Structures are given as structure tokens and as C-alpha cells.
Design a protein around this ligand. Structure first.
Ligand SMILES: CC(F)(F)c1cc(F)ccc1-c1sc2cc(O)ccc2c1Oc1ccc(/C=C/C(=O)O)cc1
Ligand SMILES: CC(F)(F)c1cc(F)ccc1-c1sc2cc(O)ccc2c1Oc1ccc(/C=C/C(=O)O)cc1
Lengths: 204, 185
């Protein structure tokens, strides 16, 4: 029911904080950083319009299917004004076997956003898209498109420039889904970061 | 890049490969089918306005299973519960099979037109990966094509953007389907 300006302001208020923090040392840091970031992500997801109307079962499913893409799109957004480096935290700016191909993708994605001049208002829309897309849900997904296109028209882009930019923005998401799949394959061995159902249920 | 929307949709519709035919028996039949489908794909790709002007090898290395999946998902559309691999090969790993039925159900639920299906395939192929901007400008042209095809259909500007968004968010699903399809292979 929210207006496109009311929506973008709710997403901007929903925004999580920026957190702080050898192969095993670096991994112990990344594992711990994401763990604490997961708790702030569950609070954020409930601040996203429409997600809290959903049954706990649906909320779980979406988060389990999107917790790494959400972490990565947040990462790629922070790291953006730091070319050649990945700002996992303000005290954790980096540049481990197998992890090299994934790091290089996350660098390329960050480099794409910057060249494309990604804005914070479009970013909060995209991260909200990923949460709701991972799995009424299509009614909300339509509302975030209307918000993105409203922000493109408010910025002065022509109707052509609007649908062209929307598409480029929605295709970089195929890459984020890919970066997530390869990451899930790499990390898993066992899991040290608490399954999100235990967390979501623990928080209510 | 000089090409119009109707010139782009018809150029791709012309490039459309033919429909082909057919446990160890099922996988062997599928390996053989796919192996014959890659030769038609490799040739279709050369007919994608922009693609032959390249790097082409890696784009088919990334999109070969996404293209095989979108094709399968497009064929099997009026066959709910079953997957139409070939007219003589209709089957009804289970995870990948279910993920493929859901996509086809979404394709049915959206009334996805063939003219829009060719555009998705060409976007899949190009977005799978001065020479780098060539891919960008072509994708921005397939998007004008998709929006024009919608304009013709009678949809409003708001009903156009939503539908563009709807179809594009399905490519994240087919990227995911391919990735988990690769692990299984
Ligand atoms: C290259 C790389 F580091 F980005 C990268 C490469 C991969 F293969 C996979 C993930 C990544 C990322 S993106 C990211 C964003 C952030 O805000 C914070 C942490 C991380 C993180 O690292 C992680 C993420 C999760 C875990 C969990 C382990 C467990 O359950 O035991 C460990 C390390
Ligand atoms: C369930 C399933 F069959 F869909 C499926 C599950 C997966 F995990 C991965 C892919 C699939 C698909 S999608 C498809 C579409 C088509 O038009 C035709 C064949 C196939 C095919 O099967 C394949 C694809 C490639 C190979 C290669 C083997 C080799 O190099 O030895 C074997 C079987």
C-alpha cells in the first residue's frame, strides 16, 4: 500500500549496521563476521515490507535460500569505492585455497556497480529483490520494480534508459546467485554459522 | 546494433534450432540428445545479432546448460508434471527435475510468448560471462525488443516494466538450476 517514496524510505530505515571483526585466522574472522551479520539480516528482513505478513515457514525458506547473496550484495556495495579490494568490514579490507575465483568474481561485481554508478536507493531495492526472489510475493516484487523505475524517472533517465538500467540491474543478480552457489560449494565440509531457522526462531 | 525490434525478433526467430528426438538407459539417451543439441546451439549463437563479432567459446561454456534448460522448460510448458526432452522422450536429481517443473509452471503462469522466449535465450548467452561494452549495448537492445514486444501485446508502461522484471528474475533461477545441474553431472 506504500508509495514509491514511502517504500524506499522504509528500506533505507531497515538498513543493517556496518560490523567490525593465516588461512584459519582470516576464515575464523569471515565465519564470525557473517554469523553476527546474520542476526542483523533477520531484523532487516522483517523491516522489509511484506516479509512479516508471510508465515514463519516462508520467512525461513527465503532467508535460507538468500543469506549468502544478501551478504555478497552488501559486501560488493561497501567495497565499491575501494577498487582491487573487498571491504568485508572497515577493519577487514582484503585483496586460502579455492576462494580465489570467488573473491575475483566479488571484485568484478563491485567494479560493475561503480562503473554503472549504483545508488544507495537502488541498492536497498535490489537486496530486497534477492530476499523475496530466492524462493503476494509477486505483488511486492512488482512494487519494488515500480519503486526502482520511479527512482530512475526522478533521476532524469529517459523511458528507454529506465527499462535498460532496470534490466542491467536485474541481470547482475544472476551473477550474485552464481557467486552464492560457488561459495556454498566451496565452504561446504561442515557449517559453523548457525542455521537461520535456529536464529529466526530464537529471535521471536 | 543498427537493427530494429521487429528486425531483432524475426532475426532470432529465424535462428531457432530444430526440435530433436531420442537409469544408464535414461542418462545415455539424455547425453546423446544434449550432444546433438550443442551443435545446433553453437550454430544458433552465430546468428545472435552481435555474437559473431568476437570469447564466443567461453560464453557457450557458461550458458550451454542454461540454454538447454530454458529450451526444455519452454517445450515442456503445456506438459505439467512431465518434462519433454524430445517428443519421443517425455519423463515425469529429483531436485533439479522439480526445479525444472516449477520454472515451466511459471512460464505457463506468465503466458510467456515464443517471441519473448528467444530474447531470454539471447540474454542468457550474452550475460553468462571496448569489446566489453559491445555485449552491454546488445543486451540494452534485446531489452528494447522485449519492451516493444510487450508494447505490441497491449500492456501498459507499468505492466511492461513489471513483466520485464518478472522474466529477468527467472534467469537468476535458471542460473541456479544450471549450477546445481553441474554439480550433479
Ligand atoms: C571471497 C569471499 F571471502 F568473499 C567468500 C568466499 C566464499 F567461498 C564464500 C563466502 C565468501 C564471503 S562473502 C561475505 C560477506 C560478508 O559480509 C561477510 C563474510 C563473507 C564471506 O566469507 C564467509 C562467509 C560465510 C562463512 C561461513 C562458514 C561456516 O558456516 O562455517 C565463512 C566465510
Ligand atoms: C534431470 C535432467 F535430465 F534434466 C538434468 C539434470 C542435471 F543435473 C543436469 C542436466 C540435466 C539436463 S537438462 C537437459 C536439456 C536437454 O535439452 C537435453 C538434456 C538435458 C539434461 O541432461 C544431461 C545434460 C548433459 C549431460 C552430459 C553428460 C556427460 O558429459 O557425460 C547429461 C545429461
Amino acid at each position: 500500500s506504500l508509495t514509491a517514496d514511502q517504500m524506499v524510505s522504509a528500506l533505507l530505515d531497515a538498513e543493517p549496521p556496518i560490523l567490525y571483526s593465516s588461512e584459519a585466522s582470516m576464515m575464523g574472522l569471515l565465519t564470525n563476521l557473517a554469523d553476527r551479520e546474520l542476526v542483523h539480516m533477520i531484523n532487516w528482513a522483517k523491516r522489509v515490507p511484506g516479509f512479516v505478513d508471510l508465515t514463519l515457514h516462508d520467512q525461513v525458506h527465503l532467508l535460507e535460500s538468500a543469506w549468502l547473496e544478501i551478504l555478497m550484495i552488501g559486501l560488493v556495495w561497501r567495497s565499491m569505492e575501494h577498487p582491487g579490494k573487498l571491504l568485508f568490514a572497515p577493519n577487514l579490507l582484503l585483496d586460502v585455497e579455492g576462494m580465489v575465483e570467488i573473491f575475483d568474481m566479488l571484485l568484478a561485481t563491485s567494479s560493475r556497480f561503480r562503473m554503472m554508478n549504483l545508488q544507495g536507493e537502488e541498492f536497498v531495492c535490489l537486496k530486497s529483490i534477492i530476499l523475496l526472489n530466492s524462493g503476494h510475493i509477486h505483488r511486492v516484487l512488482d512494487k519494488i520494480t515500480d519503486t526502482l523505475i520511479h527512482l530512475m524517472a526522478k533521476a532524469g533517465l529517459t523511458l528507454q534508459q529506465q527499462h535498460q538500467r532496470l534490466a542491467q540491474l536485474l541481470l547482475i543478480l544472476s551473477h550474485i546467485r552464481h557467486m552464492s552457489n560457488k561459495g556454498m560449494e566451496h565452504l561446504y565440509k561442515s557449517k559453523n554459522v548457525v542455521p537461520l531457522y535456529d536464529l529466526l526462531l530464537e529471535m521471536l
